[model samples]
Target chain A: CPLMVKVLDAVRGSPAINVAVHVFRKAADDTWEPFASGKTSESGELHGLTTEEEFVEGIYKVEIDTKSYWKALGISPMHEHAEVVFTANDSGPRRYTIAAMLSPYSYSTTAVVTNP
Target chain B: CPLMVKVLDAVRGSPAINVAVHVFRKAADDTWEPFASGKTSESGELHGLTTEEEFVEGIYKVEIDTKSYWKALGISPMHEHAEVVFTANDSGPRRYTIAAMLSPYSYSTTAVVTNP
Candidate 1:
């Protein structure tokens, strides 16, 4: 099954903190287009994510502000990050995977793949 | 280097919306302890983060409300998703990779690995 559009948050590793999520889709020109981005709810939900555009079949990516999100609270700097390669299709809701990491000093691109 | 504590949100693929974030850390008993969790701020910033504990060198994970979060706004049900495999170390913040897929109907476990 493919994973539907959702918000991804770290569940383990270092302490949790507040931050912003920036989404981008790979454009035909080999660049990223500004996709729908939002804030994490009190429970870490992406709040009121403004739609960037309809999901297109191709590659997509994300960027997170770990430094500002943590530095704002006097925590050590967490590195910036991006998601892995994926193809968005019109297939009926399927099981696609999502993953992420929190670092002791920066962000970890080491993703975990589970049946979501 | 270990990946610092951070939040991951799905980019590309589909539209975005609001939801809650929960965090849990593993305890000495080999169970997950409710760690610091918060909401994603507008712009996708996780706001008001409460720390769970000191960084531990080990495994980590995350959870997303694809159905509930999307259904709340009449969006198609997105599959619940989780992150991929990862290992935390005592080493200085090193580069680990994280990956996730947002499908048209479900979540994909097909993860992408990159240096974070």
Candidate 2:
């Protein structure tokens, strides 16, 4: 399978609302499966793929809950929501790298892109 | 008294992180007091100030509840949070304007600046 993708805003330490990470994989046959789930670290990083979705290369979506995160901080934000679309072609034995966060009022998705 | 000031992102319509706008005033001797509070509209606007801070102005901070906004949308955002600082010299009967949001994982702050 093709291999390459990137994740930004790795988990960082600080008083943020909350950060949760979840992954879903789409099969070639047009099916879906849960890959993994985790929380962002203080450094704002989740490291490599810990979900089952990383095993195969296709399409997947990472949903984050950002609203609750900001609520936890006693703040209200604009553009509290966001998303990115990306194609994960990582079939190598190496653990794929990415970043994730959890929030109540905001969230985002990665874009599907091919490595150069 | 004197008069003059401005606000942004007035209330509108849209699904964003939880947006709660709060006002605070710094007394002449440098004390703090609650002015008022409100939420953002769907179009990402909170309209003019609804608090009592507009009466007398020395310096003030507008607190936004942004973290919960993103969390509500299932997204994790960077620059997911933000804020702006300003002065309200408007002792006039005019209403001041501003915007706000609510999120969980992220939030923001504004710099202190005076208008020309």
Candidate 3:
């Protein structure tokens, strides 16, 4: 199983399509450098988001452009961005899925480990 | 066990004192109405935050001033604000504690139930 990411609407309980997603890795100097960027598909999935990066033992960050998404839906987002940070180590094949469940007022992320 | 809130520094694992916290309730129009506001104490605790309002069965939000906290520490907050939302019901005395663990790049919240 490849690493994936999904965005969803909490109120409608449906897929949030066309939402922008960013992946970053914390550099040695403590700056988050962009690893990759993509947008959710019609089904609200970013297939194999991890395939573009080399997963090493370090901190990784994912940023969702919820501000733009909520604005596209004609409402103001309470927060500017939603960020998810996790640690990656020399574990298994380093495959996982991160899902961002978001609404106008709040947001959260869930990560599940899987195998490819 | 009165309802309380605490802010903490993730890097130093220390109490985040004098951090601003705002409480809000979901209104009939789905907008968040401010209920109360306060700052954390030297122990990073907001003593009895819930006593300022009646915790009815509805959605409540807590907003932390991460931007200011980070700026006070001479850094920029990745996000402007950190918001935590939880559902409240008429189960008990609504005694609980909300803790916001925050860093420069990420933040998370924890909720614990206790008796007063």
Candidate 4:
């Protein structure tokens, strides 16, 4: 997989489970078009968001539905959602992993990019 | 001050200097009203964003101007900006340190909340 995601719950000090993730790619007209979506697995990881061939060179957006995740956990969060947008494959094809840390009221995200 | 921020450059493995930061608080009409703004210091941290008495209990938004930071570094970034929104002082007045990690194309954020 060219793109992946990992989510952790900072309050609980554990991996965030069942978090919803949506991926979008910027179209030439500058609108974001849906590319893929998934939920985190038991380990709080979502894999295979896109293939290298299909990902190509463009800007991408990853939206994490954190509000619902906290709601399910009986907490009211502040943000409508958490998102990361970035250019991909500008230099070359690389494997990208977005590691996110979440709290009911706050969250953090980091990206790990490595050559495939 | 009740709120602070720390920004790191993931690609450069150092503090992100001179990053612009803006803060807002949700008003009764559900609109965000500007509260404060600042830039990261040489150590990549912003202090005194708000004092405890003024912070109170409310939803707050922190916006990091990552695009300009990268552009100033002679690189193009993906997102227009990075932001964090969350409710504060629900339990009680606390100190918050928003730690953010950034790359030209990706970024992550985490919050460390502690009692005063």
Candidate 5:
């Protein structure tokens, strides 16, 4: 399934544009290897994460680089990075999404395993 | 009043020792100022964080350097740093604590407003 990611400002619930998102999938050796990467668009969203093979049942990790993003805006550093761990099942690849909200001080997130 | 903090390993529920903890207090101008800094003890805890005056009712920030701490353990780099944003109220200075659990892949927390 394609993984969708969205980033937003925590305090005002505004889009957090241009933030980098790094995605990794756990390999057979139990080591994480990069699968996809991108930055938030003007809408603070990234959709249709790609992989060579069909999305299977396994663990995936997403890293958000909020430190650099906020620093570019002259904001105080809070989290240098924040990570989210999720499991993708045998369902089709287009069913997963991760939406995260962040600020200089904190962050919160929600994950969708399968779309309605 | 004191702000206590504790860090734990998310996977195994073990204490995360020697992690550096940086505390910040938000000023009237809304910029954060460094208040106190220290490292976790053998218990993965810091107690009785000191301040010059009574802990006022305001926003307080705590930054946990899990990157350095976990890197020393030869783990994958996940979160460069993680932050906890909290508010201390007018009730009393010693009425708050932030307890967080973390793994390279994710984190969760509990904030104490008062002792039972």
Candidate 6:
């Protein structure tokens, strides 16, 4: 797998389970086209969002639907969605792990890119 | 003051300097109205984004111009901008610190809320 995601709930200090994730690749016309989608498992992880061949050099966006997650917990959140946008595999083929920490009112997302 | 921001550059593992931050509050009509703006200091912090009286219970957005920060370092970034949106002071008056960790292609934002 070339891409993976890990989500954490900061408010609860544990893995964020069942959070929906959507991946998008930027097209030539500069519009975001859907690539793949998944949900965080029990460990707050979603692996194999895309294969090496499918995730070539391009701009990608990872959207996390955090509103539903918060609402499920009986909390009202402020963001409709949270996203991390970045160029991938620009220099060479690499592996990426996006780690996101979320709360009802805030979220933090970081990327760990490594050699494949 | 009730709100503060700290921006860190994950690529360099240091404080992100001169990153512009804009604050907005959701108006009664559901439109975002500008509240305040500032730039991160050498310590990666912007203090006094809003005062206690002005920052009442409402939804707020904090937009960080990360693309410019990366471009200034001669790196091509993917995101045009990044933002953190959340409702503030809903239950009662409190203090907030928005901490953001940024990379060329990714960013993580977390909030620390405390009693004022």
State the weakest 10-residue window (summed lDDT) of model 3 chain B.
B85-94
Give the runs in model 2 whose Cα sits over 4 Å from its true position.
Answer: A1-18, A51-54, A76-83, A90-116, B1-116
- The TM-score measured for candidate 1 stands at 0.38
For residues B38-112, what per-residue lDDT tens digits would candidate 4 score against the true structure?
Answer: 999999999978776789898888889998999998987766677887777888788888888887655666667
Q: TM-score for all predictions?
A: 0.38, 0.35, 0.54, 0.70, 0.53, 0.73
Evaluated with TM-score, which candidate comes out highest?
A: 6
| Model 1 CA lDDT for position B3 | 23
In candidate 3, stretches whose alpha carbon ends up further than 4 angstroms from where it belongs are: B1-116
lDDT of 5 by residue, B35-92 (tens): 8889989898998687536577777778888778877888854345666666566444
- Candidate 6 Cα RMSD after full superposition onto the native fold (Å): 3.8
Writing each residue's lDDT as its tens digit, candidate 6 over B58-81 gives 888888999889999998775757
**Deviation in angstroms for A4 in model 6?**
1.9
Tens-digit lDDT string for candidate 1 (A1-116):
23222333342322233546676778889988876665544433343443223544566665565566556656665454445555554453233433244443544343222222
Question: Model 5: per-residue lDDT, tens digit, A1-116?
Answer: 46788888766567988889998888999888888888989999987677426566677778788878888888854355656666666444546677777766556554555555
Alpha-carbon error at A73 in model 4, in Å? 3.8
**Superior by DockQ: candidate 4 or candidate 6:** 6
The per-residue C-alpha lDDT of model 2 at residue B88 equals: 61
Candidate 5 TM-score restricted to chain A: 0.86
Model 2, DockQ value? Answer: 0.05
Q: Candidate 5's error at A37, in angstroms?
A: 18
For each candidate, the alpha-carbon lDDT, in order, equals 0.44, 0.47, 0.74, 0.84, 0.73, 0.85
| Model 5 spans > 4 angstroms off | A1-116, B90-94
Tens-place lDDT digits, model 6, residues A23-110: 9999999889999999999999999788788999988888898999989988877566687877788889999888888877667677
Q: What's the lDDT for residue B51 in model 2?
A: 39
Model 6 error, position A100 (Å) = 1.8
Candidate 4: the clashing residue pairs are: A108-B109, A109-B108, A109-B109, A110-B108
Error of 1 at A53 (Å): 8.6
TM-score of chain A of each: 0.61, 0.55, 0.88, 0.96, 0.86, 0.96
